[PDB]
Design a protein around this ligand. Structure first.
Ligand SMILES: Nc1ncnc2c1ncn2[C@@H]1O[C@H](COP(=O)(O)OP(=O)(O)NP(=O)(O)O)[C@@H](O)[C@H]1O
Ligand SMILES: Nc1ncnc2c1ncn2[C@@H]1O[C@H](COP(=O)(O)OP(=O)(O)NP(=O)(O)O)[C@@H](O)[C@H]1O
Lengths: 394, 394
C-alpha cells in the first residue's frame, strides 16, 4: 500500500497530506504552523496539537516524519510531491527533482522570494529525510506556460521582459489544470475542441481560460496580486492611483506593497474581515460596506470571466471552484446574474445544493453556457503527477 | 452668425477650434504649441506658422484672440467651451463657468495636477479676454459619474476612497458620450433599452460600456494610465511587478511613473514608435516586435471589450472611434476576430472603406452584435453643450 507524501511550505507553515496511491484518498493531514516564530507547533488531523518551539524547516519535517514513523507509514512513502509557487519560464510541467531542477528553482526564485525559498527549504529537508524516495516538483505557474506572448506581455519596455523576465505568469495552475480535466468528464466535452473558464475563488482568486485543454489567459500576473480583488489582496489597481497615493501620503512602494497584499480587497473595503462568511452575515445585518465589498468582488469576477472568454473560439462552460466557488451559493448566483449578457441561466435549486454534492451542474437547460461547481484537489493533482512520474527511468 | 470658441489647454499647448453655431462646422482651428518652452509658436490652419517666444497662456490666447480680431470673428464669439480633464465627483454634467465652478475645479485639480492647472490657466486667460461672453466647462470624467460603486471602487482600504477620492473616474467621456448618441441613430436603437460598447482608440485609448444611455463601466482609472495598453502608456500592470521592478533596478515610483506613461505601450514593446502606422508598416516588413506590440494591443482591447460587456443586460453594438478606431482597417478586423466568442461577423469589404465614409456599419448580417465606426468629434460635443447652456438664465 504505497503512499505519496505531499508537502506545501509557506513562509510561516508546512502543510502536508499523505495520500494512498490506490485511491488518491487522504490518509493523514496536518500543519507545522508558526514556523520561524518563537513558538512553532505540529497539528495532525485527527489528533491533539503538538508543540515545536524554535524549529527550522528541517526540524518541523523531522517531527512530521516521526509522526509517520509512529504510524508505520515511513516505509510506505514511495513518492514525495512538493508544491512550488513559481517556475518562471523554465518549467512547463511537473518534474522529478534532481540537482539540476533544484538549481533551476533557485534561478527563478527571485521572481517570488517569499514563497520560493520556503518551497526550496521543504525540498532540502525532504531530500535529507527521504533520500531513497523519488521526489517531484509541481509548479503553480506551469499550466499557464501555454499563454501566447500577446497574453503574457505587459505594455512595459521590452527590456523588462527580455532581461528581467517581467511577464504574466499566473497562479493556481494546479487547480485550474485539475478542474479543467474534471470538467471535460462532467460536461462531456471533447478536450481538444472546447472552451472553458475556470474561476478559482478562494482567499486567493483567479480566472483561467482553457481552450482545447490549454491555458490561454489567466488573471494573476507576474505575481499573485494582479487580477480579481481577493480576501486581502487589491487585484487590479491603476498604477497612477498608486503613484498618486505615494506622493500624497508619503508612503514608499514597500509600504504600498504591504497595503495592497495584506490590508486590501474584501478586508479593505469592508473594514471588517477577509472572510466571505463574515461579510455575508454582516450584509444580512445591514452592513453597507460589507455589501459594497461583496458587490465589488462580484463585479470584478464577472468582468474577468467575460474578458477571459475573449481568448476562446467558443464558450462551453464556466466552472466555479475554491473555498468560495465551492461553498458560496450567493457569490455564484450574483456572478452568473452579472453574466446574462453571455446567455447564462441558473438553476437556483441546483445552485443551493451544498458542496457535499461535489461535481455538479448548476445551470438550467436553456443556458447558452454550462455552469458547474467542481471541487478542486491540488493534493490529488500533485499525487497524480507524482504517480505518473514514478514510472519514469530518471 | 454666432460662433463657439473651443479651447483645449495642455501642459505644452493650446488647441482651439471655432465652430459655427449653425452647422457646428469648424471655421478655423489652430494650436499655440511649445507653450512654456523658450520658443512658443502659433499655427492656424490654413495659414503660415507664427512664432511667440516667451509666452504664457494668457499671451498665447491673446495672440489667438488677435487672429480672430483680424478675421472679424471677435464679435461673433457668443460662447467659449473649455475642455477640462478631471471633474472628480463634483461634476456630473457640463456647466456654465462662474466663480463657484472655478473654485470646484481647483478643489479636484490635485487628482490631475498636470492637466487641470493648464485647463484652469485657459479659463483664466479666456475670462480676461472675453468677459461678456458666457463660458462653459466640459469635463472628460463627467459621463462616467453614473458608474455604480461596485464598478468604481478599487480593492484598497476604504479610507483611500472616503478621505482621498481614490476611485475609478475614467476619461474620454466627451467622446464616449458623443459616439454613443450617434450610435442610437446609426443603429436605430432605443437609447433607453440598449447596450453598447464604445472603443475609443487613439494615442490614448479606452473602453466604455453604455447601458440605456449611461456609462456603467470604463477602462481608464483614477488616472488615464489604467486599462488598455496605448501608444506610450502601459495600461493595466501588476502592482507586484512594478514593486519588483523598483527593488530590482533601484527605480523610484517617480521614475516608474514616467516609464509607464512615456516609454511604454506600443513604443515600449516595439522599440520603434507609438504610431500605429509605423508599426503596421514595420510588421509588414518582417519586424517581430512591431507585430507583438500590435497583437498585444489587440488582445488587451478584446479582453476589455468583452469584460465591459458584463455590465450590459444585452449587447447591441460595438463602436470603434478615435484615430485608430476610425482609420485602422487591420486593428478593427483583428479585434473583431478576437471576439468570435460574442458571435460577431465582419463584412470585410465594409471594414476596408476609409474614414471618408464616416458613420458606417462594418458587421455582416448574421453578426450577433452590430459593429460600427463612428467618427468622434469632441469639439462638436463641447459646442453642443455650450449651445444648450447658452439658453439658460445663469
Ligand atoms: N460556506 C461558505 N460561504 C462562503 N464562503 C466560504 C464558505 N466556506 C469557505 N468560504 C470562503 O472561502 C475562502 C477561503 O477559501 P480557500 O479555502 O482559501 O480556497 P483556497 O484556494 O485554498 N485559497 P488559495 O489557495 O490562495 O486560492 C474564505 O473567504 C472563506 O470564508
Ligand atoms: N490610417 C491609419 N491607420 C492606423 N492608425 C492611424 C491611422 N491614422 C491615424 N492613426 C493612429 O491614430 C493614433 C492617433 O489617434 P488620435 O488622433 O490620438 O485620436 P485621439 O483620441 O485624438 N488621442 P486621445 O484624445 O488621447 O484618445 C496614432 O497611432 C495614429 O498613428
Amino acid at each position: 500500500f504505497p503512499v505519496v507524501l505531499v508537502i506545501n511550505c509557506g513562509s510561516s507553515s508546512i502543510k502536508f497530506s499523505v495520500l494512498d496511491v490506490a485511491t488518491c484518498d487522504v490518509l493523514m493531514a496536518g500543519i507545522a504552523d508558526g514556523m520561524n516564530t518563537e513558538n512553532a507547533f505540529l497539528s495532525i488531523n485527527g489528533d491533539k496539537p503538538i508543540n515545536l518551539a524554535h524549529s527550522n524547516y528541517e526540524d518541523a519535517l523531522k517531527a512530521i516524519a516521526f509522526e509517520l514513523e509512529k504510524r508505520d507509514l515511513t516505509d510506505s512513502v514511495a513518492l514525495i510531491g512538493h508544491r512550488i509557487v513559481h517556475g518562471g519560464e523554465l518549467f512547463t510541467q511537473s518534474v522529478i527533482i534532481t540537482d539540476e531542477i533544484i538549481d533551476n528553482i533557485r534561478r527563478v526564485s527571485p521572481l517570488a522570494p517569499l514563497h520560493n525559498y520556503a518551497n526550496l527549504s521543504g525540498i532540502d529537508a525532504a531530500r535529507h529525510l527521504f533520500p531513497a524516495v523519488r521526489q517531484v516538483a509541481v509548479f503553480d505557474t506551469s499550466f499557464h506556460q501555454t499563454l501566447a506572448p500577446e497574453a503574457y506581455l505587459y505594455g512595459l519596455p521590452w527590456e523588462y521582459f527580455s532581461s528581467l523576465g517581467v511577464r504574466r505568469y499566473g497562479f493556481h495552475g494546479t487547480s485550474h489544470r485539475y478542474v479543467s480535466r474534471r470538467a471535460y468528464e462532467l460536461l462531456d466535452l471533447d478536450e481538444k475542441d472546447s472552451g472553458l473558464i475556470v474561476a478559482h475563488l478562494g482567499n486567493g482568486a483567479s480566472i483561467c481560460a482553457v481552450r482545447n485543454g490549454q491555458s490561454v489567459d489567466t488573471s494573476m500576473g507576474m505575481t499573485p496580486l494582479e487580477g480579481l480583488m481577493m480576501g486581502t489582496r487589491s487585484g487590479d489597481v491603476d498604477f497612477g492611483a498608486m503613484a498618486w497615493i505615494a506622493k500624497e501620503t508619503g508612503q514608499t512602494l514597500s509600504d504600498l506593497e504591504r497595503v495592497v497584499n495584506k490590508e486590501s480587497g474584501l478586508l479593505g473595503i469592508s473594514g471588517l474581515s477577509s472572510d466571505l462568511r463574515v461579510l455575508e452575515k454582516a450584509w444580512h445585518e445591514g452592513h453597507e460596506r460589507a455589501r459594497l465589498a461583496i458587490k465589488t468582488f462580484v463585479h470584478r469576477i464577472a468582468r474577468h470571466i467575460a474578458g477571459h472568454a475573449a481568448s476562446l473560439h467558443r464558450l462551453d462552460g464556466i466552472i466555479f471552484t475554491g473555498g468560495i466557488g465551492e461553498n458560496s451559493v450567493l457569490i455564484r448566483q450574483l456572478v452568473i446574474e452579472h453574466l446574462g449578457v453571455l446567455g447564462l441561466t441558473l438553476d437556483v435549486e441546483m445552485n443551493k445544493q451544498p458542496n457535499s454534492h461535489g461535481e455538479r451542474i448548476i445551470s438550467a437547460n436553456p443556458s447558452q453556457v454550462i455552469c458547474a461547481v467542481i471541487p478542486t484537489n491540488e493534493e490529488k493533482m500533485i499525487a497524480l503527477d507524482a504517480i505518473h512520474l514514478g514510472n519514469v527511468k530518471a
